Design an enzyme around this catalytic site. Structure first.
Site, short mmCIF file in Angstrom:
data_model
loop_
_atom_site.label_atom_id
_atom_site.label_comp_id
_atom_site.label_asym_id
_atom_site.label_seq_id
_atom_site.Cartn_x
_atom_site.Cartn_y
_atom_site.Cartn_z
N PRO A 297 41.07 -0.53 20.88
CA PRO A 297 42.16 -1.02 20.07
C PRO A 297 41.67 -2.01 19.01
O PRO A 297 40.67 -2.70 19.16
CB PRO A 297 43.13 -1.68 21.08
CG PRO A 297 42.22 -2.04 22.22
CD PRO A 297 41.25 -0.88 22.31
N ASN A 298 42.40 -2.02 17.90
CA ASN A 298 42.27 -2.97 16.77
C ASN A 298 41.03 -2.67 15.92
O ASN A 298 40.93 -3.26 14.81
CB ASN A 298 42.24 -4.42 17.28
CG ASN A 298 43.50 -4.75 18.05
OD1 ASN A 298 44.61 -4.67 17.51
ND2 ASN A 298 43.35 -5.16 19.33
N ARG B 160 40.80 -7.16 6.59
CA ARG B 160 41.25 -8.57 6.45
C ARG B 160 40.17 -9.42 5.77
O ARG B 160 39.04 -9.54 6.34
CB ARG B 160 41.67 -9.22 7.77
CG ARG B 160 42.62 -10.39 7.56
CD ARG B 160 43.13 -11.08 8.80
NE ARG B 160 42.58 -12.43 8.81
CZ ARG B 160 41.95 -13.01 9.83
NH1 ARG B 160 41.78 -12.37 10.97
NH2 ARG B 160 41.49 -14.24 9.69
N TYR C 14 34.96 -11.52 5.86
CA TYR C 14 34.69 -10.87 7.18
C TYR C 14 33.92 -9.55 7.02
O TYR C 14 33.49 -9.02 8.06
CB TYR C 14 36.00 -10.66 7.95
CG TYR C 14 36.65 -11.95 8.36
CD1 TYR C 14 36.06 -12.77 9.31
CD2 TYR C 14 37.83 -12.37 7.78
CE1 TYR C 14 36.63 -13.98 9.67
CE2 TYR C 14 38.42 -13.58 8.13
CZ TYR C 14 37.82 -14.38 9.09
OH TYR C 14 38.38 -15.57 9.44
N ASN D 107 32.83 1.43 22.48
CA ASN D 107 33.24 0.05 22.16
C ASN D 107 34.69 -0.07 22.63
O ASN D 107 35.57 0.31 21.90
CB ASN D 107 33.07 -0.31 20.71
CG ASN D 107 33.52 -1.73 20.39
OD1 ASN D 107 34.09 -2.37 21.25
ND2 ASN D 107 33.19 -2.17 19.18
N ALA E 247 39.20 -4.85 23.27
CA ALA E 247 39.92 -5.73 24.26
C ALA E 247 39.96 -5.03 25.63
O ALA E 247 39.99 -5.75 26.66
CB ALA E 247 41.32 -5.94 23.75
N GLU F 216 27.65 0.62 26.30
CA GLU F 216 28.74 -0.25 25.81
C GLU F 216 28.26 -1.02 24.59
O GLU F 216 27.19 -1.64 24.68
CB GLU F 216 29.16 -1.17 26.99
CG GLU F 216 30.27 -2.14 26.64
CD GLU F 216 30.61 -3.10 27.83
OE1 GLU F 216 30.11 -2.97 28.86
OE2 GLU F 216 31.29 -4.08 27.58
N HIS G 89 29.52 -3.80 21.39
CA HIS G 89 30.49 -4.71 20.76
C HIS G 89 29.90 -5.20 19.45
O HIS G 89 28.71 -5.54 19.41
CB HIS G 89 30.75 -5.92 21.64
CG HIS G 89 31.30 -5.51 22.95
ND1 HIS G 89 32.65 -5.27 23.08
CD2 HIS G 89 30.71 -5.29 24.14
CE1 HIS G 89 32.83 -4.83 24.32
NE2 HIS G 89 31.66 -4.87 24.99
N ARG H 267 32.26 -16.29 22.69
CA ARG H 267 33.72 -16.42 22.49
C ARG H 267 34.37 -17.02 23.72
O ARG H 267 33.69 -17.71 24.51
CB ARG H 267 34.24 -15.04 22.05
CG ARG H 267 33.55 -14.47 20.83
CD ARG H 267 34.11 -13.16 20.39
NE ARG H 267 35.50 -13.32 19.93
CZ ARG H 267 36.33 -12.29 19.67
NH1 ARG H 267 35.95 -11.05 19.84
NH2 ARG H 267 37.54 -12.53 19.24
#
Lengths: 152, 150, 151, 151, 149, 150, 148, 150, 152, 148, 150, 151
Positions: free
Chosen positions: C15-16, C23, C28, C79, C82, C103, C105, C112
């Protein structure tokens, strides 16, 4: 006054350091004093047949004794316990002892700060909690108390 | 004056469609549709165009937040059970950078200990809980003051 | 000495990640997920890897795509975004189809919030890449090729 | 000719990595650390990267090599091995010289004992690679080049 | 007739102080006394015993690496490094020599941080609190494990 | 030149009666009776009178410790599962004030995390684990040295 | 009046003091701090010795060598504060009283820095007062030993 | 050589009025009045005007901090038991923005685990513990150096 | 009246190792035996028409079976479970199963000892808890039981 | 035979005893309990003094004032049991033996009530036995002081 | 019967002898004897020979498990309170290596947090809780299916 | 003596249970979820129980099916699979419609990873069955009939 409602007696309690509201770097941290907030809230309450009493104190005992004095006289409490939220079992037991429904209000978002501020000795026995909405939180708690007591 | 119009999105999470259905004499009669119709009317009088989505589908809430980018000024969200579980909703709201207020009808702190944790409360402008349907109206009033500096 | 056997590799994005490049592009970054996957698909094709891709905000779409990979796909790069921290259902889908995965990211999850330090996939992944941006997908592809061809 | 600015990169390897390739080579693998670093040095040279290397069982030798890298090295690749989980001194050396670094582990630290899930470096690393074997050093080199050349 | 066993004893930091401070109160035996007696006990049973004590973690790690394909068994008292050194755990896992962990003092009777060992779960076993005789018991155990006796 | 006789009690807890029974080719052939017969003979050569009780009954172990008061010089105990659970055994050994060594055949630190906790290890003179039946012989040799100052 | 022998021990990375971005992080080197502290000690008939090391073993072996020679230790173990049981056991083993000093406030940093393997056995702890912390520890040591 | 006068406030929390009273031959003879008289004289020699409050009343300490706003340059505080319990004192010191040093006579790290936590240490300029009464003098010397850049 | 005079049947239960009371270093740890305590308590009870029965055991099953046998016969229990306080869910479930009110007594202050002794499987379901007051704690529990049952 | 001076201290909210829904929660006030206890003490040549307060400072200052005057303290700190290190340090500071009393069973309530800053330094603790708990603490104090 | 006979042992822990005794109109009237008589009859129809022990004595349960070695095909156990406390029972069941199902009449997850931990659930073939006395019948049916591959 | 009132019972199956009988049938078993539900529907029908079923990888389909059960369904049997450990939304759906339920798992959840020891449903379930394979659904059916008919 031509009120058809039964009068509500509401007590607002403010905890330590809230006397400093509006008097450090007003251009940066905000200008409204606690006196300004309570004067506006008292006027809002009076229009809805709510008699509003207030105490701010840095003395835990003064808040506890004001809660004891509220027994069989006050219908609802709005409380901003400030630092005592995290530390005072004695305030929890005063509010349990007099059996008056209350709303907990914080000006700042307690969940956005240090982890010790995430714990409240009052939130689990409050009717509800408002945080992070600044001084308008007291007005929302007043509106909620009126609705909860008059079933509106 | 004449105010600039605010576009506000209200998001409601899972199970809130059940409001007003179970033991109405005990738990209350107001439906979510009743609450949102009244809130939409309240907003319109203050030059706020209020949009709403309730869903049991996490993806519908995420996609609605994505669609709000550069269109919506403020979000009011009651994530219901997803408050405690959804990092994806947290990351959607962080990704579109719209300020929001978190609302719960019930006092989350008065229930099981797992309800004391929120993936949204630390990034919300504020949180309201336990004040029933009026909590949405308070969040609306707060959003108007935060955006208009009133 | 011999021509390679084709590898079928599936890339899954959670997601996202559809927001990549949107943005504050000056702050970014400008690369979209479509740009990343087009470049990755071209890199794979030169090494006789047929790369398929799904990004979704719908957990069920990722689970169903993993089910559909059974006996068809040789390797997965995922990936989960969340869902890394929350989805036991994705762990159980990957265990159920028995395809090796890496995996990835974009950001350093360890830099974080503390909730991001926990993954329901990292202990069963062949390995994990984080914080290396879009190049992380290329590294996972290179690793998959080496793991499958013994090169 | 190289038209790029030369990058100076230091690879640091922690304790016990000198054992690579020694024990039951038919079972656990045949590649030595010297083999890995020779191949990585050749890969680096093709992209105008000068690669320096230290492996040590001596925490002080790693700390002192980091101190000596100040204003000389552009990027560090470090496999701290067991010191990942124990050495605040190495964390403070890397904070003190302010050179960006990538953390690499041959094995998947998340698939092993719970004490290996904690790193004193991962939160301050640019990124982390684990479980991809010797190729992880190559990926870290490729990442360093991209991060420094903005490519 | 027995086949010779090669056994290495490793001692960690601060054990060089044994016998030094207030000998009338805390005891008089030095580590050199303990290792001389243990070497003689080993020699009687056709065990060649080698020893290193160090305050330097790297010297212990490098001695373990040097033991690979030469040493049959390790007896180790890691002292403070018991609680802190993953590097020592990984050295012993890397050379795959069986070992026994020994402490002179009862680690369970001291501060709570001393209850955790990075070696105890991979040791063949552990002896604590029995003073210098614990090294002799570890030697006897090693001989039994290797000779099936 | 005679030594003074030592009286030593060995206590074994639950399930240790099963030693030698299950898959002897895989898990080992020695019974607890074999171990204790050999240990009794080892003790006798050094003028130690060794008594033994194995029980699945916590009360039998507690009552045997009570009965040891002013009669027994030293205890060797393998409490087996009761190591992790029995405060009553700790309080029996504290109550009679006889020094003891704790022995386990298997390495308790190599098993489940609940086995890492002992209600006896902090008050024991010392602890032996993982060295099989020889652990009882080491505990006997330690006891003799501790009592005779050798 | 009777001479005191005091040893100052400094742990890893403290050799970097004054080196990185001096305009931002500060200009004083460890050598500057120790030269000034040695002069302060000499005025009060204290002979001050010093070791800074990135090598845990050098600190341990210096503590061993202090036995029956040194009256008091001031130690800034830096990162080893949080990790070294071996340094705790060295200081317990030689039985010399010590004060723990940190230049920075360890309580204002990451949560792992809130734990010390020395603070519970130190005579006392000073943190966050910069280089002056070593002077305070010296003044405390003199008072503790001379009963002043 | 000319200095600007510093105004420094020393705050002492509960039970410190008992200093020197119980078994003086065993626990020590110096009273808090002795410590503060000596510290006030030491401060005066460096052109520091030192004011002091000791109280068993949390509100008196909070109100004294409020009164210090724009008047006091530096605070030295020994909150005694309130170190471990008072968020209100933390919030008073954050609210008036005066730099402070935390002092304890005893080594808090050598006592019960609840004493290892301070609501002040992370926002203090620094912390001194275990050096007895001289800790107040070190905090004074530090304050002068921090304010005068010496 | 009559309700004040009816016989009470009270059972005292003592757990493991309490048979050792008075035995070890009597000059240092004290001289009173459990038999001395129970003889005096039985006489105190008899003066108030309380029939006091007692079992001390190192056998958990004997205590459980005595509780089962108390059902519909015993009015009140005083229990010092000793080490079993911290470990026995079976004793908790025996006392819940027969639904007889009880007071928990310890001779020593359990809160002053190791942290594992701070937990009791009985304290939350007891009428109350006495610790640290030595043998007199049994007499206080007897006095409390009589007051609770006779409403005095 | 020699007079004992005993101080009873009661913490916050205990002034509410007997006030709320007396038919449900009980009718006895704290004044009733203390009048009866004072009379019980007087029969055994014990002079019993009492303070109940909502003010933590009043309890601390009364403990300070007890030094070298009072032989024994009985304290029900109510909510302050769980929160006040200052009360613990007052009682440690004056070194008078005390018993902790609660009317209600603290172990039957919320988990935060299971922790006391006084229980580990009390001579003993009584909870859940209602007003009679003060009488048992008085009986215990007399026995402990007179060796009866 | 055409089937091979199964030998099954049912073990019941402490306090289960009280079933049916207290306030039968409120808590239920069925005794453990009633449950076991019905279960024995159900078992016999499927060529299962059922042996049963209920005990308040941990040692009797341990010794019954020891005696089951190479005699019993399957165990059904309701350890009652010993579920939460007895490592010795775990080690008895591991020592004889007979498959077992754990049964509780009540839902252990709906009660106090200490009841959420079992020393048997992780080594059981399966667990049944909250289904009352029928749970023993389900465990019997499961054992038959597990052993006969039906 | 009286003819029984018909019971309406809903069986809900969570994610990945569609894979039953597919992977390594010689090792993990040959029975499909369709086989299990056909047999359970027949068992229910003999006792005047009308059994309805939904399996889904989509959390929303399970929630919406629970909402649709309000005032129509007498009892629920649910195997939430991975959602047992993660879904507060499913807990709140079941609390919101006030239908009693039994939780079933084919595998012993307590014999697996420690995260599987936590359920958001077990404390509000009438009961829980795990580790008894497909027969657990039949036991839950028998329990539901007894709980509703007081037999």
């Amino acid at each position: 006054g031509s009120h058809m409602t039964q009068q509500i007696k509401l007590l607002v309690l403010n905890g330590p350091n809230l006397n400093l509201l509006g008097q450090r770097e007003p251009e940066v941290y905000g200008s409204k004093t606690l006196d300004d907030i309570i004067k506006a809230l008292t006027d809002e309450a009076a229009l809805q047949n709510v008699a509003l009493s207030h105490l701010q104190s840095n003395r835990e005992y003064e808040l506890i004794e004001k809660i004891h004095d509220a027994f069989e006289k006050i219908d609802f409490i709005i409380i901003n316990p400030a630092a005592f939220t995290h530390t005072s079992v004695a305030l929890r037991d005063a509010l349990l002892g007099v059996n008056i429904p209350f709303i907990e209000v914080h000006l700042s978002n307690v969940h956005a700060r240090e982890s010790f501020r995430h714990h409240s000795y009052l939130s689990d026995i409050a009717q509800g909690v408002i945080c992070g909405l600044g001084a308008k939180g007291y007005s929302f708690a007043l509106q909620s108390a009126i609705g909860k007591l008059r079933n509106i």
